[PDB]
């Protein structure tokens, strides 16, 4: 089916049903988070062209990133559902670890699995920043909470490179984008009112029946008088 | 806040007016503070609603249409709030099914060799069977 449509029979209920999962599901288990991670990928490609904004993708990203750093006491506006999924400090974050999540592993489910789910979620974040949020006028507002989260990632894990590249990438986008006051109610001036004329195509300088009676009755009345005269 | 007229560019504006406009664009900073707790000191009135502009790119069509109203003239005096309060994910899905107008299903000309990635053309890169 054509994903790049404003309205579709199957995509729109699927996307609405699907956006519900990115927000409603607790995502309090590695299986649950990995399910959400793949859910992100499909919605990302559903908008591979339409490039529309899905607020749940912002919400899902914020909690999962914070879920793996559990709290640092600096993000009290983010609702966490599990505090026991914090990644350990001993994690290397330099080995080459597969970011592809098999769906068959979902049934099976530790640190390596937790880290891999983080990357696949993390890699999707760069694509969303690079494509979708970059165009949006509120990019700085949308990326501001995410930027703070990744600063914790770099500070906690210096060796971990993925947040730094995206933090550098995020910095590049903000520099070029000109954050100017929005201007939308500039309207094209409306013309003077407009009416067509009313008339008769062939102009005369029961209604017809009445006139015929009047015209000739006078003729009748006149001619009787002269005859009687 | 929705629109600052000082930032509109006019075709008749003289070259000096153009230059002054660019300097004004460069030096602007959003003054709204999110951490101030007193609503009379947040300096929100000097800011603008860029966030509402993003919502007109919302994935849902009708939601995008509602956000587009800010780009349209404010002919409507008010909106009946009770018609917008109790909406849920279930209600939206039910409303989608109970649609007054029925459309034809469309198909994608683009072809993907594999729906999921391996462990030619892959639909979902990064996810594998």
């Amino acid at each position: 089916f054509s994903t790049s449509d404003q309205y579709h029979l199957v995509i729109t209920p699927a996307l609405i049903l699907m956006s519900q999962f990115l927000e409603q599901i607790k995502f309090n288990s590695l299986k649950r988070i990995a399910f959400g991670a793949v859910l992100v990928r499909i919605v990302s490609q559903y908008q591979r062209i339409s490039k529309r904004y899905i607020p749940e993708v912002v919400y899902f990203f914020q909690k999962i990133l914070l879920t793996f750093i559990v709290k640092p006491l600096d993000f009290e506006n983010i609702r966490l559902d599990s505090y026991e999924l914090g990644l350990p400090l001993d994690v290397d974050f330099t080995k080459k670890r597969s970011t592809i999540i098999p769906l068959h592993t979902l049934s099976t489910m530790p640190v390596d699995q937790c880290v891999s789910v983080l990357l696949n979620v993390m890699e999707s974040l760069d694509a969303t920043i690079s494509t979708v949020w970059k165009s949006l006028p509120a990019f700085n507002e949308i990326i501001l909470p995410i930027q703070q989260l990744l600063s914790a990632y770099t500070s906690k894990y210096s060796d971990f490179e993925k947040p730094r590249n995206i933090l550098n990438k995020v910095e590049k986008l903000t520099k070029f984008t000109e954050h100017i006051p929005l201007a939308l109610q500039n309207h094209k001036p409306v013309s003077i009112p407009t009416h067509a004329p009313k008339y008769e195509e062939n102009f005369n300088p029961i209604n017809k029946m009445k006139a015929q009676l009047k015209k000739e009755r006078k003729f009748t009345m006149k001619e009787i008088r002269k005859d009687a005269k | 806040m929705l629109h600052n007229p000082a930032f509109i560019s006019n075709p008749f504006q003289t070259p000096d007016q153009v230059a002054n406009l660019k300097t004004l664009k460069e030096n602007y900073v959003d003054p709204f503070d999110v951490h101030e707790s007193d609503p009379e000191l947040t300096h929100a009135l000097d800011s603008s609603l860029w966030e509402l502009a993003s919502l007109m790119e919302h994935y849902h069509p009708n939601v995008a249409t509602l956000a587009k109203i800010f780009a349209q003239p404010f002919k409507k005096l008010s909106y009946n709030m009770e018609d917008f309060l109790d909406w849920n994910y279930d209600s939206l899905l039910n409303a989608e099914s109970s649609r007054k107008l029925k459309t034809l299903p469309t198909l994608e000309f683009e072809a993907f060799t594999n729906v999921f990635d391996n462990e030619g053309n892959v639909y979902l890169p990064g996810v594998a069977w």
Binding site: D5, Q6, Y7, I49 | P61, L66, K100, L101, K102
Partner: peptide, 30 residues
């Protein structure tokens, strides 16, 4: 032809060639 149709559908051209704005008639009311 197909590419032009896809661009039209992305912009709100809905094929029963109506518009998305028409779909928003009474949706919020009920």
């Amino acid at each position: 032809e197909l590419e032009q149709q896809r661009l039209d559908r992305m912009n709100g051209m809905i094929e029963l060639e109506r518009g998305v704005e028409d779909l928003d008639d009474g949706f919020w009311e009920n």
